[PDB]
Design a protein around this ligand. Structure first.
Ligand SMILES: Cc1ncc(C[n+]2csc(CCOP(=O)(O)OP(=O)(O)O)c2C)c(N)n1
Ligand SMILES: Cc1ncc(C[n+]2csc(CCOP(=O)(O)OP(=O)(O)O)c2C)c(N)n1
Ligand SMILES: [Mg+2]
Ligand SMILES: [Mg+2]
Lengths: 584, 585
């Protein structure tokens, strides 16, 4: 039946007995693509019956559906014209892993971050209302995403529309790990009272409410969804789904199966089984030790403990000293700041792309008060996650231009661990550390253990004519540029490990004027608002020439990394070529 | 006077109920004098008198810790914790800021100005206590308006998991700055109308314990409630109903006006300087009321600060469904605007520079990744305006201009501003932000471009040589003056440029200047790091062009003297000219 689904109209042609068979067909096809190609396993298997019912009852694209995150919209794409991308291995990559309007009229937003569906959906509804449309507007949002303040604001506003607004809460009792927040006790009393409970968070927020206990039964959902169709006021449809339904291993281990690398369908084991530790593992190793020796130390995550190497066992080990605040980046920062104000030693670890949510809290809650909380920022690089919503391109311009902030850029493992140890020990600054997005590199030479004199860059090779400031993960690159500059142009360049993203070594920059005419900067991130521009500004009235290397200010999506680097001149021979072109 | 003998909460605990009530009276008298003479947040502090007395009657600050949301309503806190003379003697009026400040007092635990952060910062204090085995009480005080902000939701959500002492005072006076907005406020009405007994309780749904206090301006009732929860061993909400501006008739009848007053006549309520003339907020209101009438797809959005758009309660009435107030939810305001523009609407979101700082990810992902043509109006961006540390409008350029796909415009005069806003509404190709000039309303006097679709065209306004001046936005006048004095003092005829586009560089014009110029300077009204000027420096980095960038340093300042600060950053005509000559010779 699935081979003949080209739009929601074809879904409406089926009998209910046929809808159930289609559910099976979808799961078979998902099992193949997801085991071969990786992806969000649990969220999509759990969403099968609700997506069929959604496109059975509603008339997309007049009616519009918005998924929170969109990591769970595979079945949506499967039923709106993109099935061939899931049935034929040769076409696995013809769709992104998130919603995309360029692919389909059935997709209204590129979405990857959490708790944004409800807000964007109310945008659609208000737009309808101002222009006299009459379509249904649906947001689909996970129970974990409910912990984000943007979703609270969206619900708050939705309760005021006075018009059609449909909010499907997909309650599978799981975020990535387990949920956290007192709200989840409310969700729970409601499931147990079959939606009957008087004290209802959603009703307290001003909204109407209905509950569906069998979130994996096409009939129940069609029933539910038909009841709310063409409704004229805001309503919540709270449904209970079983995360990863239809695949035993997923049902028994929900955290592991939220996202899988390619694996064996029969055993569930990954296809490539060797792994060497990454900086996440290291970091978990360090904090479990420190937290044992020093009861003031507390590790914090916003719904992504794995970014800190914190398996369910390790969380258990850490007990009261490991905190998961839900998907609430804003709060994580203010919490860290208050902890540090009343004698605790907080360490908040977060992805670069997600820390984008907390600019004002970093600035006001944290830095105005100058509290010594520690922030670890992971995966900041131009060569990592490469879909547009998860681009870790912007943390240097996000963070490094805030007053009072100290942002450190380690280049190797012992240095990373030394700044982190010093971070916890000091009491004078908020400290953020850009965890290197590389394999774990051994420093091989003893490293400074005190970073209290700010903005001292470390010369690692005395040279002349050209100086290279190779920041963080791009130290390796500065090293290769040094070699190739020597072998092809016989320039012996000064190589510099800057360490401090948040300031300029004025005195060294001055000393370089003597035996150098060109300084270049390499940074693993976008150029606008980043580190290199400060160097350009410092030399602006002097006879020192400067080149800045990094990523251009532009969105890119599922790109080839070799290209993107070359396109931005981030290769050793492109850099040396540019130097000589400037020198002569 | 009892108030002259208060140096700490210990002194507050000495009084009887009759003396506490007399003390309430003295505080209001003293407040009326300070606020009518010196201005300030009138309504919120008059509403908080009895609750602040009771707090320091029952709790033992600074061992116990109190955190005020925003802290605009912490004047009585200061009056009862040792800083009373800053409220009794006019000569010392300025010896305290209008917000909490730890440098002033150990009774102050955070510098706080923005909304909905108390609960989160307070839970931090509690978690820290818990990690070190303290046993002090931890209190957050939050207004009903601040509850509409998502940080407050996350904080409550987290607090409900502590399993330890946590006291959250909700000061419900049924007002934000204007009236509240959000469905949650209907549940608050239910709770107040049922004297806290209603089954449907938002606070209990969040995992929290709860009690209600119907007379939030009665010392006895508050002492009562606060004593019951003292040393409680789990998180609790104490929901109290206060009358905004209690004790002063004119404020009680107009709560929106008296949220904040310039100095005024205690007897008439009239401002001491009553002449008012049109500013860009007023201009903006006029434009949007016209367009919204002519074009039914236009909708104006505020995040609880409608005055920033000149939107008096009448004007809101007029605009009806076409004027939207989303509460204090800056983040949501952006995503709403983006969804509106995706479904045939034309949204115009107006916001203060200092507050738009909340929405970086929403600007980036909700708005700019999808490239939706929502319009953003960013007010008060300047180094010469609001000058307390938490309300510094220094950072909107580095916050916004480095987001990909964003078009961010800097008008220099009034006709240009409106022409830029008209085009913004008409185009369908870009998200557009407009940095409303933080100057007097200046008439352009020469006809202005009406189409801004070809991006990154800087407008040469005077052809010269040797030195070129890129004077962005509010600093166009300053660039005009640097040109004059350069001409009068060094006999250089400098090229003057109005750049307009903050978000890009005129490659072509920048290249042509290399012919008849050796120096380029940039002037911007904001912090330099991540700002406009650095893109010019970077562009010329490999050329023989020299560049200077003028703006504010990356540094926090608080209640500063503005002339001083300008001089310190070389932001004067005589300092810029001097630096130019110092580079040339
Ligand atoms: C802003 C932001 N913060 C954090 C994340 C991390 N994240 C990606 S998917 C996901 C799961 C969301 O949980 P829920 O909505 O309950 O869905 P489920 O996995 O249970 O289907 C999370 C936390 C994100 N994508 N964006
Ligand atoms: C982030 C942010 N957005 C907006 C404001 C504007 N603002 C300043 S004071 C205030 C009033 C808050 O109202 P409420 O919390 O109910 O207190 P009340 O004035 O009624 O005592 C507002 C909206 C702000 N300070 N910070
Ligand atoms: Mg979930
Ligand atoms: Mg209020």
């Amino acid at each position: 039946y699935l081979e003949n689904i080209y739009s929601p109209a074809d879904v409406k042609k089926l009998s209910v007995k046929e809808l159930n068979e289609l559910s099976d067909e979808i799961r078979v096809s998902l099992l193949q693509k997801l085991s071969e190609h990786g992806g969000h396993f649990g969220p999509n298997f759990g969403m099968v019956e609700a997506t069929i019912a959604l496109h059975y009852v509603f008339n997309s694209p007049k009616d519009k559906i918005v998924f929170d995150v969109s990591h769970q919209s595979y079945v949506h794409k499967m039923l709106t014209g993109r099935k061939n991308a899931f049935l034929h291995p040769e076409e696995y990559d013809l769709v992104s892993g998130y919603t995309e309007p360029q692919e389909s009229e059935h997709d209204f937003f590129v979405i990857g971050h959490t708790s944004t569906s409800v807000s964007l959906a109310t945008g659609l509804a208000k737009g309808r209302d101002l222009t006299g449309g009459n379509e249904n507007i649906i947001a689909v949002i996970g129970d974990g995403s409910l912990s984000g303040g943007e979703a609270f604001e969206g619900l708050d506003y939705a309760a005021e529309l006075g018009t059609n607004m449909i909010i499907i809460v997909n309650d599978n009792q799981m975020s990535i790990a387990e949920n956290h927040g007192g709200l989840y006790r409310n969700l729970k009393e409601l499931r147990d009272s079959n939606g009957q409970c008087e004290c209802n968070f959603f009703k307290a927020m001003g909204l109407d409410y209905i509950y569906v206990n069998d979130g994996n039964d096409v009939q129940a959902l069609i029933e539910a969804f038909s009841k709310v169709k063409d409704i004229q006021h805001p309503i919540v449809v709270h449904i209970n789904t079983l995360k990863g339904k239809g695949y035993e291993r997923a049902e028994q281990d929900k955290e592991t199966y939220h996202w899988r690398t390619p694996f064996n369908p029969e055993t569930g084991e990954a296809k490539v089984s060797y792994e060497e530790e990454d900086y996440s593992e290291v970091t978990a190793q360090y904090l479990l030790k420190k937290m044992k020796e020093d009861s003031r130390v507390v590790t914090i995550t916003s719904g992504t403990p794995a970014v800190l190497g914190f398996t369910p066992d390790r969380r258990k080990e850490a007990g009261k000293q490991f905190v998961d605040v839900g998907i609430a980046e804003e709060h994580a920062v203010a919490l860290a700041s208050g902890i540090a104000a009343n004698g605790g030693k907080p360490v908040y670890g977060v992805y670069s792309t997600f820390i984008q949510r907390s600019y004002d809290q970093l600035s006001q809650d944290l830095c105005i008060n100058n509290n010594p909380a520690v922030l670890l920022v992971f995966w900041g690089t131009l060569s990592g996650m490469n879909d547009v919503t998860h681009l870790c391109f912007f943390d240097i311009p996000l963070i490094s231009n805030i007053p009072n902030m100290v942002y450190l850029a380690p280049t190797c493992k012992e240095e990373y661990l030394a700044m982190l140890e010093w971070s916890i020990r000091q009491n004078e600054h908020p400290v953020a550390i850009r965890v290197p997005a590389t394999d774990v590199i051994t420093c091989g030479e003893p490293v400074e253990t005190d970073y209290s004199v700010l903005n001292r860059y470390k010369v690692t090779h005395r040279g002349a004519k050209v100086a290279i400031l190779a920041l963080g993960s791009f130290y390796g690159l500065g090293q290769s540029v040094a070699s190739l500059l020597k072998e092809k142009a016989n320039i012996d360049a000064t190589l510099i490990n800057p360490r401090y993203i948040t300031g300029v070594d004025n005195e060294l920059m001055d000393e370089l004027k003597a035996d150098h005419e060109l300084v270049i900067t390499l940074e693993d991130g976008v150029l606008d608002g980043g580190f290199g521009e400060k160097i350009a500004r410092y030399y602006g009235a002097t006879n020192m020439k400067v080149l800045n290397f990094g990523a251009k200010k532009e969105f890119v999506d599922r790109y080839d990394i070799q290209e993107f680097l070359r396109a931005n001149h981030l290769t050793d021979e492109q850099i040396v070529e540019d130097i000589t072109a400037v020198i002569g």
